[PDB]
Amino acid sequence: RSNNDVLATSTMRVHAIKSELFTQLEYILTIGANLRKSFGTAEKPKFPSSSGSTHDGIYNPYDMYWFNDYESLKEVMDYLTGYPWIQQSIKNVTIIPSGFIKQESLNDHEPVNGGDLSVRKLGKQGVSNQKDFNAISLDYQSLMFT
């Protein structure tokens, strides 16, 4: 399989393609404020610092918030326009591909400020799935076959 003993060849072409598609997304809203407690109001404003989590071996002093679905995030981000002195402490919300994050790395929902709305904090010292990429994996037989 490694020597130079083989017949000259010049005719390679893309014979086949497999793809692991990221097909559903997740979002982590990471701002530096504890959403899960009281905001104050427009002129009685409370600025709650954030506690931080640890995931995949890293202290983040920002709170990170899970969202497996976009609406939920939309909700919460809207509610958040209400309270500028809070939304200013957002680092960003990042979009990642789905289920790399484990249930057991998350809090149960929590009411936000009041509030009707709820969010789940990423942490619990958890780690992320080291997903196997099966769609793109080929076992010997499957491989030759393909």
Binding site: G52, D56, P61
Partner: protein, 114 residues
């Protein structure tokens, strides 16, 4: 290496066996196994606190013994360690280094013997 120690010393050369170091973070130390007289011993030149840098190297490499060889003039140097972040009554941010690797029991220097 599965060589016979008694009459195979002459095979200790780079087309028959090979050796590399790595920190799985893209620092590497390529080692021409032909250039060790008798022994594959790794030492380190480390400093700490003020500056943090461990550079591990192969002892007496390339020396026709026994002198410091190349010494540390070729070495795998480890030095992107992590800093942890904090907040105040204002977050100053941490630096993410080898932590994730550590969480999977791969923070370390690894030797690849081919």
């Amino acid at each position: 290496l599965g060589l016979n120690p008694i009459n195979d010393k002459h095979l200790l050369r780079p087309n028959i066996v090979t050796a590399e170091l790595t920190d799985y973070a893209g620092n590497r130390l390529p080692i021409d196994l032909s250039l060790i007289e008798t022994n594959l011993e790794f030492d380190s030149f480390v400093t700490m606190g003020a500056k943090n840098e461990i550079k591990v190297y192969v002892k007496n490499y390339n020396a026709r013994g026994n002198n410091v060889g190349q010494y540390i003039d070729n070495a795998l140097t480890i030095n992107n360690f992590d800093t942890i972040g904090f907040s105040v009554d204002a977050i100053t941010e941490g630096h993410v280094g080898y932590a994730p690797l550590f969480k999977q029991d791969k923070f370390g220097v690894h030797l690849r013997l081919g």
